């Protein structure tokens, strides 16, 4: 009855419509276990959560460039900030593993034990890290607006709006790398080239994308 990724074909049996962004798209039956699918629902979110941060991060630093500002491009922002600020590179990445490997194993023991991390084992914070459901912690810190409570009919709508923007952010961050390896320039330089002449300045006219140039 619901809209599916491919009209006509029915959704698979393990994939009734309750998740956000559910469109029955599991052709390889990778979510056929109901407990690995609990893991991949966690996995689709945090990939989409980082990609929404990422795709906004590529775009907003490329909006500033080509206008006249002193911004680097996203493939060259890595070198230019461990050189301008004299930041030693291994001591930057290790602290990234300390702070996030802290924040990740908390998730990795939310999945193993959802009632856990809420025993005052942390600095006294108990029900802030309680976790509402899979991939959606909530509480005081992760939802300071309090949008996951009050009306829950609009919260199910926000769940879908997160996954929809989260899918095409992953496609964008798969396309920023693809626009860079093919052409060799920034993303909004590729957009403005496509807006200069929409014919002949597309992907078909590189010779990197189709080898039948």
């Amino acid at each position: 009855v619901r809209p599916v990724w491919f009209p006509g074909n029915p959704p698979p049996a393990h994939l009734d419509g309750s998740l956000a962004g559910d469109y029955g798209f599991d052709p390889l039956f990778l979510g056929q276990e109901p407990q690995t699918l609990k893991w991949y629902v966690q996995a689709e979110l945090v990939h989409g959560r980082f990609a929404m941060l990422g795709a906004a991060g590529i775009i907003l630093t490329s909006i500033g460039a080509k206008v006249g500002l002193g911004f680097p491009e996203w493939y060259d922002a890595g070198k230019v900030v461990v050189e301008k600020n004299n930041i030693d590179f291994p001591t930057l990445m290790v602290i990234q593993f300390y702070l996030m490997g802290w924040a990740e194993t908390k998730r990795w023991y939310d999945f193993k034990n959802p009632g856990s991390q809420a025993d005052g084992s942390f600095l006294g914070f108990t029900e802030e890290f309680k976790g509402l459901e899979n991939g959606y912690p909530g509480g005081r810190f992760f939802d300071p607006m309090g949008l996951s409570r009050g009306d829950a009919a609009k919260y199910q709508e926000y769940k879908q709006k997160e996954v929809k923007n989260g899918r095409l952010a992953m496609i964008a961050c798969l396309g920023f790398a693809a626009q860079y390896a093919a052409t060799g320039k920034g993303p909004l330089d590729n957009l403005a080239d496509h807006l200069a002449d929409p014919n002949h300045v597309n992907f078909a006219t590189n010779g990197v994308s189709i080898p039948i140039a």
Binding site: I63, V67, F71, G146, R149, G150, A192, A196
Partner: protein
């Protein structure tokens, strides 16, 4: 039955016209949690009162001192009481005041007493609305003024952002920006200063320097969202 932000519409279910200035405008669902509605009802009033005092601050300063420009006037005042002695007083004298206001938010019946003049006491008022000492000689109805505070307040919060975004685009004060608009309306708009067509983006430059010197170490002065301007 009440007036709305958009008259044909309906207010959301969490807005029932109880609060002052409740015209039903919350499209982003932010007034759903009643724990967080009290935090926002406080923070709208605080954001309004500073902005009313700031907009009347810039307007009074512009009609008596055409010399200096308010965006730059945090740099040029030349106080004899030091650059950081001012900040040290303002830090301590606000970390007192705000924390009293914050404890009033947390427990409303907890902050009523003058701690050093215990014979004096605030009345048991409403949260965000102290009264007693802060409100003598109130004119007319109190709920009428409670809507007049927010309507003038919401007008002033949009006014201060209008002051800042005019101060970064034409770089002059908000009568000098008004005299630019009243001398020549058809050419001194933001739609006249800027346009983005699909193929090029014409934006105004800053009328603001990137940095300032100010007594030794330099202070970065950035144009708030330069690059994302139209």
């Amino acid at each position: 039955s009440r007036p709305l932000w958009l008259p044909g519409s309906t207010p959301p279910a969490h807005l029932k016209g109880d609060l002052p200035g409740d015209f039903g405008f919350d499209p982003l669902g932010l007034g759903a949690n009643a724990e967080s509605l009290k935090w926002f009802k406080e923070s709208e009033l605080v954001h309004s009162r500073w902005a009313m005092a700031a907009v009347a601050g810039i307007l009074v300063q512009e009609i008596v001192r055409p010399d200096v420009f308010w965006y730059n006037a945090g740099k040029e005042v030349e106080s004899p009481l030091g650059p950081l002695g001012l900040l040290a007083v303002e830090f301590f004298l606000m970390h007192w005041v705000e924390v009293r206001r914050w404890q009033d938010l947390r427990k409303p019946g907890s902050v009523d007493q003058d701690p050093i003049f215990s014979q004096y006491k605030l009345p048991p008022h409403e949260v965000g609305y102290p009264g007693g000492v802060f409100a003598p000689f109130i004119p007319g109805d109190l709920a009428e003024l409670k809507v007049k505070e927010i309507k003038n307040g919401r007008l002033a919060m949009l006014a201060f952002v209008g002051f800042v975004m005019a101060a970064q685009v034409t770089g002059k004060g908000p009568i000098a920006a008004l005299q630019e608009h009243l001398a020549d309306p058809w050419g001194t708009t933001i739609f006249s200063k800027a346009a983005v067509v699909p193929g090029q983006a014409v934006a105004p430059p800053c009328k603001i320097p990137a940095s300032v010197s100010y007594k030794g170490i330099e202070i970065p002065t950035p144009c708030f969202l330069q690059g994302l301007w139209p």
